[model samples]
Target: PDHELVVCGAPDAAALTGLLTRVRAAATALSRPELTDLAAGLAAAHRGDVPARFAAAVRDADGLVAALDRALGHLAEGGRRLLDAGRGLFLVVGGPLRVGLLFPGQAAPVHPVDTAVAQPAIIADSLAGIRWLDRLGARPVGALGHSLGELAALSWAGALDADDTLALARARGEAMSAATEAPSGMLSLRADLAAARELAAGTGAVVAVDNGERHVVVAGTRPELDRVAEAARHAGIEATPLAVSHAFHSPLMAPAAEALRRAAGRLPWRRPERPVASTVTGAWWADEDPVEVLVRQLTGPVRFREALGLLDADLLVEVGPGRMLSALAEAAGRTAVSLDAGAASAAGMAAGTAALFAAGAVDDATPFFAGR
Candidate 1:
């Protein structure tokens, strides 16, 4: 089945030479982006561009894989709903992304930081937004963070005062990245929790994320996951692989969890200024010790849908690089909205404040989204 991806999706010595050649050409010609306008001016010349053809091939392959992943994610959610008793339960899901290399190195080796960088960027973007909002005299009252979002939520609420939450996230990223490329990953399947557990019993795989009623994600070494997928197919169950390598929210990351806990303990934590909802506990974080819960969060299942029930906001705002959580919040029966594409840009926060003003969640939207 993984083979289905190869034709449908590496390497050595002189190959490195070819890799740098492409990079150098891109850097040189891309210095003046307008320079490409002249090339596009000529039609027949395009057929001779070998590099453009190679690049297009890679884009097309990625497009197919992304389309397939989206379909499988939907199938995973729908299957769970059909098995549940709640009428029109409408599972509103939000959690981690099965991310790929936004920019993978062809001439060079991929570093642990390559994959890890995105996590901190999310946290940083959020904090930047918090600061921007603070200038407008609007403070967050309640918030929920899904999977990796948990850190951003807590840091913004001032729970475990991360001197720099982004830096903290960066460190945890390295911790989570340990041996991540060693043929390991997770697969979300459509089955009840009990059935999901039974399938993974005694196997290297363990149920990591709990979506809603019957949806579950299993994480393990890739070979072990291959075995699990085959076993599920034999049992007439659908086990769809998420497009990722390192197992998140699973026992496989216990070492990283431990390291994160130790790192968290060193930080000065206060009770959160704003109540932050948690996916790990599926409840609002009460007067719990921050280091303990945050570390446990690293190695535990993301009890996502359950937490949605616990979110205590009249209107939820998803402040990030995307709108998935806002859409999920609305489906979960709460009025919600999404911020901008840049997370901390003028456009991003303006729309967020406007939605808040429109919904009566905030009192003012002075210079921004007041719409000049």
Candidate 2:
């Protein structure tokens, strides 16, 4: 029951560390991809949902509990002091919670808890942080993307330019916008996969995202989502409609997928200089055809938690409008950082750059002040 917290902190991080260490040592210990998902899920967690994601991951994940514990233990090893010491590294695990590896300090987010702004523009804001990181000389070593943020992930890994990424995003959004004939929409369901799947099977709802063991989102016709919302009420599973103009990540967007593929082919593609874990598949998008990946990504379910699981690195930061991803990462036991959510894009980006500098990862990004 203790873990039944809305935002549970570790009882003893050292205990968490030792328990996870044994699991990682086993013959069938969770592989890199699996750990990537756990870490990213933690990173993708929103402020109020930590206990749910954390408990679900620990109880249902088998050896993954060991993995989760270890990651969290690593984040908590030095507690506030480590953050104060600025030794934290980052990785961008961009999911719906505006995913990033977020936490406190000089570089901490001014408002670290809102995932409402899900758009290409969020990445526009997020990019300033990336460029600032570049200015600091600490480009992310690798990346993980959540839904539309995948393009930014690709760009962050040097697969494309920010301008190109935005163009693709705009085209993709246009295609999705045109999918409005049948009045489709999405629903966020707070229930496990099996329960949600069973309910959605007959309700015309398709699983759009499996955010964690329990945080699921479904897509379908508006009427069908209404039915799902009713069922969730009866079952005491919290359900709400997403702020969306069209049903995303569902078959409703099949047309958009094709349009996006066409749009994708028109772009100048390149292989990633650094790998970005694919949301459609668990593999990095290093050797694969980028166009195909983008095309398929439109219709494919965002294996977001799984994608984050594949990111081997995590000095993660939200280069965007809110702290949803940052809080989630922090909840999952990684040191996620985000730019100031309330500041203008450039100011927020500067604050985040300042955070990275403190961590001392990018070498002299943060210059110490002399006592005056």
Candidate 3:
């Protein structure tokens, strides 16, 4: 294997272009003159050779805070007034990697069909990468996915049987379809595992999944979720609710799971060429039943933090849209790189992955996008 830059995967030029355009638009719209000045000032402070000026700029917490508050206040007020109309623009470029797009309810829909539009693009890009890897005669030793990316990772790693994965994908589609049914009075709670678990107990609501570092996602009916929040407050625990269409990964999705199973049964199955770590179990699934595993994944906790902790990589590259996964990886104490699949051209994905590899962040650049 040539452990060097290799272009892998199917490239959908049109979709790629659309996504990039959105990213550019949003970036351009979000750019603020004041923030730009602050950024430049910070950079100058870091580069200054003189001790007093450098220390005053870098070490003066009060001054920096005041400056930051003014800048942030301006931006926040403008953003609030504007309603992030251009925010969704990022989806066009990095839409496929956005699990939030599929989940529904948290934000307005980015595309007309939600996950229906994004999933195929993701699969196409990922499979193309894999095919390219084959051409280069490189074998991936491991696979990782974050949040919604876990599904993509499972498909690539052969941890998900075709039928099950498709069913799950469809379930995601359905979830998105019914996004409007979600209530508006949602609150989000961020707390350690123990506190969350204690609050959720006997509440009839379900713990949607654990997303690492004691960060757990729970969902239920509006009433149930609210009740849980009240309980947490009563117990002196701070709780916040996520803006989503419906409760996912909780028992509430049992109907969707059934639909997914039926849909999965009709799809094809193939063995993976490499091992995939399960976010549900925080372990590797080798020679296991894919259907069963994937089904469990629907209701199981997302143990990405745990799974990442178990890996030996020096840097973790989040291969999708947004920096959420990268942030999660960093929270878990690993240097993380984020590559926006939606924003990247085929060459860009390869170059970014290669850069990370050269920097010793990953063991190797898995050709995740290959032949179209």
Q: Is candidate 1 or candidate 2 better by TM-score?
A: 2
Give model 2's TM-score versus the native structure.
0.64
Q: Residue 44 CA error for candidate 3 (Å)?
A: 34
- Tens digit of per-residue lDDT, candidate 1, span 1-372: 010100100022233234324333433423222322322222122222121111100112233234333323443454211111011011111211111000000111121334476667666656655665555555445677777777777776777554556667777877777735567778888887787887887778887877655578888988778878888998998988876767877777777876677667777677788777687788878988877777787678877667766665544556665655654555556555455335333433434543343233333333341222
Model 2 scores what on Cα lDDT? 0.54
TM-score of each: 0.62, 0.64, 0.58
Predicted candidate 3, C-alpha RMSD: 14.8
Q: Pick the candidate with the highest lDDT.
A: 2
Q: Roughly what TM-score does model 3 have, to 2 decimal places? A: 0.58
Give the residue spans of candidate 2 off by over 4 A: 1-81, 84-120, 313-315, 340-342, 345-351, 366-372
Instruction: Give me the overall lDDT of model 1.
Output: 0.52
**Clashing pairs in model 1, backbone N/Cα/C closer than 3 A:** 5-9, 6-9
Better of 1 and 3 by TM-score: 1
What is the lDDT, from 0 to 100, of the residue 130 in candidate 2? 62
